[PDB]
Write a protein that binds this DNA or RNA. Structure first.
Ligand SMILES: [K+]
Ligand SMILES: [K+]
Ligand SMILES: [K+]
Ligand SMILES: [K+]
Ligand SMILES: [K+]
Ligand SMILES: [K+]
Ligand SMILES: [K+]
Ligand SMILES: [K+]
Ligand SMILES: [K+]
Ligand SMILES: [K+]
Ligand SMILES: [K+]
Ligand SMILES: [Mg+2]
Ligand SMILES: [Mg+2]
Ligand SMILES: [Mg+2]
Ligand SMILES: [Mg+2]
Ligand SMILES: [Mg+2]
Ligand SMILES: [Mg+2]
Ligand SMILES: [Mg+2]
Ligand SMILES: [Mg+2]
Ligand SMILES: [Mg+2]
Ligand SMILES: [Mg+2]
Ligand SMILES: [Mg+2]
Ligand SMILES: [Mg+2]
Ligand SMILES: [Mg+2]
Ligand SMILES: [Mg+2]
Ligand SMILES: [Mg+2]
Ligand SMILES: [Mg+2]
Ligand SMILES: [Mg+2]
Ligand SMILES: [Mg+2]
Ligand SMILES: [Mg+2]
Ligand SMILES: [Mg+2]
Ligand SMILES: [Mg+2]
Ligand SMILES: [Mg+2]
Ligand SMILES: [Mg+2]
Ligand SMILES: [Mg+2]
Ligand SMILES: [Mg+2]
Ligand SMILES: [Mg+2]
Ligand SMILES: [Mg+2]
Ligand SMILES: [Mg+2]
Ligand SMILES: [Mg+2]
Ligand SMILES: [Mg+2]
Ligand SMILES: [Mg+2]
Ligand SMILES: [Mg+2]
Ligand SMILES: [Mg+2]
Ligand SMILES: [Mg+2]
Ligand SMILES: [Mg+2]
Ligand SMILES: [Mg+2]
Ligand SMILES: [Mg+2]
Lengths: 96, 168
RNA sequence: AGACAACACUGACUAGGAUAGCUGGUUUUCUGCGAAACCUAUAAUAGUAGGCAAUUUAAGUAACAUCUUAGUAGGUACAGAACUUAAUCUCAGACAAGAUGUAGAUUUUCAUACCUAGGUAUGAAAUGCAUUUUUUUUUGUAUACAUCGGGGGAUCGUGAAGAUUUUAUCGGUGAGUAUGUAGACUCGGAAUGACAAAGAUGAAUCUUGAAUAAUCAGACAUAGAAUGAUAAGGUUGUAUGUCAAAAGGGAAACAGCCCAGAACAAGAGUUAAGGUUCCAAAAUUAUUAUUAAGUGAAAUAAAGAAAGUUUUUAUAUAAGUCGACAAGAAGAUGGGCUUGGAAGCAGCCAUAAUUUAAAGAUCUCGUAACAGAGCACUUGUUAAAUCUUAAAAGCAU
RNA sequence: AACAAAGCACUUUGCAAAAAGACGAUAAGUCUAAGUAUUGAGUGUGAUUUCUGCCCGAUGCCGGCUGGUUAACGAAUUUUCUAAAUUGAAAAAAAAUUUGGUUUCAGAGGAACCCCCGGUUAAUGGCGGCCUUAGCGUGAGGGUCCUAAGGUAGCGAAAUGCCUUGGCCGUUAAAUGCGGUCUUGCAUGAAUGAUGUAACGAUACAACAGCUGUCUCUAUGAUUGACUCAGUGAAAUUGGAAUAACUGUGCAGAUACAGUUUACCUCUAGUUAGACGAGAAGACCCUAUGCAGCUUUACUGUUACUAAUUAUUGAAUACGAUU
RNA sequence: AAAUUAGAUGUAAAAAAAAAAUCUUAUGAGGGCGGAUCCGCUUCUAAUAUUUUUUUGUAGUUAUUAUUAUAAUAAUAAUCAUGUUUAUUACUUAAAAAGCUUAAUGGCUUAAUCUUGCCUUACUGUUUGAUUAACAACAAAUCUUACAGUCGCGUAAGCGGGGCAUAGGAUCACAAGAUACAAAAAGGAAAGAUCUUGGAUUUUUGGAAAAGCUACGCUAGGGAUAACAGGCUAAUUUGCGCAAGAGUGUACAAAAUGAGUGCGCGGUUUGGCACCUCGGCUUGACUAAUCCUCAUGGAUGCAGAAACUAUGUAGGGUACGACUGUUCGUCGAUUAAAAAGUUACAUGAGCUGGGUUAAAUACGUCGUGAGACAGUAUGGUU
RNA sequence: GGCUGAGUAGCUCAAUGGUAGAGCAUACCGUUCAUAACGGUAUUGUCUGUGUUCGAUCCACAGCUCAGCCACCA
């Protein structure tokens, strides 16, 4: 009830102030006096050995989170007649 | 308010609670701080009523009337004792207010006195009050060491020696 | 009269057709495993369902349990008085400079009136002790400018005016690293317990598939709470265990306590709790002390009293401790007052003296009031060579 | 002391085809009654003397409007689907109107009960306050609020009185009783009748005299049982028993456990302290989404009964009402 | 006393340079070595932080003072300032309180508050992972992600699937819309199905349309809940003791007396719990906290006698009658005295049945009524 | 959701398109030789709002409040 702990590294806060995980990592409880001197945060790191808060000068540690798959090369193949021999669509035009 | 009638609401009921039992080496209230002599409860911890403390004060005044002295009270009645009807059956909520009380730990000062009186006269007054108060009481002078539990810190004994596992 | 209608009538008898979440009963042996009396829902609370979960035996296991190491969440016991709550106590002012006076010594410096650059005087300062000073007709530093009204007095005082002042008085305000207080105070803060990771150990204890139960007033013990009355073999949670469903040894007898988990025998076998003079298996086994009351010895009755006794710690003694005995224990003075009377000794006030070997303007009796008899106190005689007095603690009465 | 009762009172019944009332799966019909308002039925009270007061608001019943409401009926309305036709559309097309079938909506007027008005207490029922006073008390009296009306006469510590053993008087050596009397009667009261006598009562209470073994205080005597012998021959009951005392223990009251104590074995007649003695699910309390009977402004229903109307069942005239 | 307004912390703002060390990091040198970016050891460089650290520098400008010949040098003071001084900007300013739809707790001040502009994502469908597998089951719930569709705000990043968080019940039936599934011979339709939506003291709120009496009562059970007794307890008592001593006692605490209290015993009264579901007569037994009888201490208040108080002591006795159903209690008159208690408040397979006490009846009161009452009255298989 | 009635001064009641009243409960005065009666006067003003009409306690609409029966009551 309220922000006893605040969302930190790779975490989001819900409507009811519930803190979730935004990535697949490991929970960490820490304090960041550089960001706020009177707050305690909860973060998620990708390496169990990491230590928060990360130095403000070090590059961000982030994972791709994507899988490589062959792209779809489907080209225009739309027919006009159905299997029943009927036009798949009829186009009318109004003229004045 | 007063030490026998606190500035508290009688409607809000208070739990029975238990007197303070210092098991970490605390000496709070076991020494005379204001007067020259005191009255110490040396046997056990109790909960004294506001009527039993008022009678103890009248006994000291009745014995020391016509003399110059200054009486200090080191206890305050701030515990509401709500007594249910002894004729009632168990349950049906809590009881109604009966009187004010105060919780006192063991070897704690109840009263203190400072005056030009003789040591003997003060002793008699405190003795008369100890007979009318619940428990057993002792005459205490100013300057004597404090009390850790039921052990006096005499002969240079410190609180760290009572915590040391080795004592033999 | 709820009276009678053929054992029956608040609605007979007889034949046909019921239910009962309630009570009772449910029949042979061996073997393996082995609960619960809790949660949620219910027209429920004597019931029932779904979970937790007992069982069967197949798939799995990076399963589960425990410890170690590292990490994390959270604020109890404790401790403390920071914040908050009750009550209480103390303080509310300190220093430097300046100013203001006083008796001085009459030396130096300085300023003026002068005389003739020195003396002559004059004063002032220097100097010692008082003295004023936080909002003052006293500024500064350091500090919370650090305090305001009401009421009771003493001054100045005007045509009544209340300006100025005082309090070991009241209330408020300010300050305190002052004292206490705690279910809804926690700045400090355990152990325990909980979560997850790796490793190791272990008696498969774990999960899943399939099949499929019982149970849903629990009791006591220990710790810590609420409630009651700090009562209940009371009621109600939490932690742990036992009983329930566990026999056996111990607690005289014993569901719940102390040990220990019974497949059957044998053994002066080895042990646990517990015990060892006899009943009754094993010590009348050793060491140092206490008690004299059968206290006590397997269920602590209290406060309290007291030349019971022991020990310790102080202390007295041939400079005669302790006890007794002999005498003394004065004088100013019947203190002053009070009172019919108050002479040490109804009551009130005072109780610096004086002289003595010592003698309270009086500690206990006594008188209407005196007198008188004792005491504190003083000298002497008797007399102890571990032998005085008090306090504390232990065990007893 | 309850019921009945003579007496008293109220409601009802005109008899023309059925007097009312009661009975009749429900009628014909029967009793009433071969009766007729001084008859029959129902209701309460309960001879007689002296009496029976106030209130029709509520409830019930009775009477009454060409009134209000008003189901059926019904003036005026309205809709679903579909067939055919017409119109429209004539693009991939519905849609609209009329008729047939089918299926909905709908309410001016229009009954009783009810609303409204009046009547009825020997109908069910009801029958209060608060101030002030000629001096303190006590109110002839006065003022005021409320109600349908405010308990009248009489009776009154009663079969009614909790406080209470009410106050006083009589009765007893001694009165929580009984009788008389006074009142502030928690919570008397007039046909759920009020009140006072005569007579009556195996009613209930109290007192007096006499009388007595009721008692002080029991004794003796008689018969039948009880007891013994002979003859015949039950029953309830019974887990099994070698079935003592104490203190303790314990599902909390021990012949049975612990400890100690005491006791030779076995019967007879007495006795009933215990065996939480026996018998009776006797008695109380609670539980069951167990029963029964009864009550009612419980829920949901059926009837007596009342009201309207199609049908059996055809007309005439007059008047009033909506307009 | 109580109206409005103005106030109520401090610091900084020319500019640094350099050496080593203690860690910590680095998607730095694709470092090196074992097994470019994987991993535990690893040097170097760089960055952040920490030392009070070893220091060096602390000018320039304006002014003052001093020396030197208007300038130079040194020292001291001032110095954010090219800018509407109402300056501005950055940092700091305990806690509580106010505000944030509503109680309370927590939270927000760097936004979740306030002001303003534009807006209506208070959107449609499907869906991820969680609440150590929501409520110790299931269901209705809570938080959260992604994709597609297309809208808003914003320079942009991005934010929005209502509100700072925690307090509003289904099905069925009914009603309003959509979808085009099926259409009981066939073409339609009716009635159904899917999606969206609305109306609930469905408040016994996982969801029945529901008033009572029985003393005329019945059956099945429970003693899982009562009354009597026993058991545990001892608040209480009409049961007692000890301790202390205000006070009374003409004097004088303790002859007698003993305020409000404290420490206890005991199990007699009224109570709590729930282990367990009357009185009289006859005849005893036992206790001792003693009414009489015996011995005895104290008693300005023991002259004697009598009585008061207390210490031993329970052998024997403690009677008669009136009232009441009574134990209790009141009263009359005697007596050496006419005291108490326990034992299932001893004793009903020993008696009594007056009280309490089922069916009958009346009264008063309560109830619309049937009926009821710790009410009263007469009667009632021991 | 549908329909109907309704309240005027301190108190109790009248007034229907046209003045806004009566009685009572205090108070002042008058009357009387005097008192009590009696008489006169005084205020305390249409439930609220709006609209129609030359003109509104009056008619129309909305609401406050009271009351009648309704609608829902899954
Ligand atoms: K005491
Ligand atoms: K013994
Ligand atoms: K009668
Ligand atoms: K009437
Ligand atoms: K009537
Ligand atoms: K009438
Ligand atoms: K109609
Ligand atoms: K009368
Ligand atoms: K017997
Ligand atoms: K009866
Ligand atoms: K229980
Ligand atoms: Mg009957
Ligand atoms: Mg019968
Ligand atoms: Mg096993
Ligand atoms: Mg268990
Ligand atoms: Mg239900
Ligand atoms: Mg059941
Ligand atoms: Mg903390
Ligand atoms: Mg228990
Ligand atoms: Mg069992
Ligand atoms: Mg066992
Ligand atoms: Mg033994
Ligand atoms: Mg051996
Ligand atoms: Mg042996
Ligand atoms: Mg004298
Ligand atoms: Mg004198
Ligand atoms: Mg008559
Ligand atoms: Mg007839
Ligand atoms: Mg009669
Ligand atoms: Mg019709
Ligand atoms: Mg009509
Ligand atoms: Mg009458
Ligand atoms: Mg009558
Ligand atoms: Mg024979
Ligand atoms: Mg026994
Ligand atoms: Mg045996
Ligand atoms: Mg017999
Ligand atoms: Mg037996
Ligand atoms: Mg769960
Ligand atoms: Mg078809
Ligand atoms: Mg429910
Ligand atoms: Mg729920
Ligand atoms: Mg029980
Ligand atoms: Mg004597
Ligand atoms: Mg003898
Ligand atoms: Mg008895
Ligand atoms: Mg018996
Ligand atoms: Mg009879």
């Amino acid at each position: 009830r309220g922000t006893l702990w605040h969302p930190g590294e790779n975490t989001i806060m819900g409507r009811d102030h519930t803190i979730h995980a935004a990535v697949a990592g490991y929970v960490k409880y820490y304090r960041d006096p550089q960001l706020h001197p009177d707050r305690q945060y909860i973060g998620v790191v990708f390496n169990r050995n990491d230590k928060l808060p990360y130095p403000k000068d070090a590059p961000r540690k982030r994972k791709l989170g994507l899988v490589a798959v062959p792209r779809k090369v489907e080209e225009v193949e739309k027919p006009t007649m159905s299997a029943s021999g009927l036009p798949l669509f009829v186009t009318r035009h109004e003229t004045i | 308010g007063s030490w026998l009638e606190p500035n508290l609401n009688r409607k809000k009921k208070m739990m029975k609670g238990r007197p303070r039992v210092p098991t970490g080496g605390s000496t709070k209230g076991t020494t005379v701080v204001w007067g020259d002599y005191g009255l110490r409860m040396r046997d056990h911890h109790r909960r004294i009523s506001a009527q039993q403390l008022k009678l103890a004060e009248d006994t000291i005044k009745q014995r020391l009337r016509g003399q110059k002295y200054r009486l200090y009270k080191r206890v305050a009645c701030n515990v509401g004792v709500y007594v249910s009807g002894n004729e009632m059956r168990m349950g049906k909520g809590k009881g109604s207010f009966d009187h004010w009380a105060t919780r006192v730990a063991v070897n704690q000062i109840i009263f203190e006195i400072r005056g030009q009186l003789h040591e003997q006269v003060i002793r008699d007054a405190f003795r008369l009050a100890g007979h009318k108060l619940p428990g057993l009481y002792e005459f205490v002078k100013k300057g004597d060491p404090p009390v850790v539990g039921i052990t006096k810190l005499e002969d240079g004994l410190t609180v760290e020696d009572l915590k040391n596992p080795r004592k033999k």
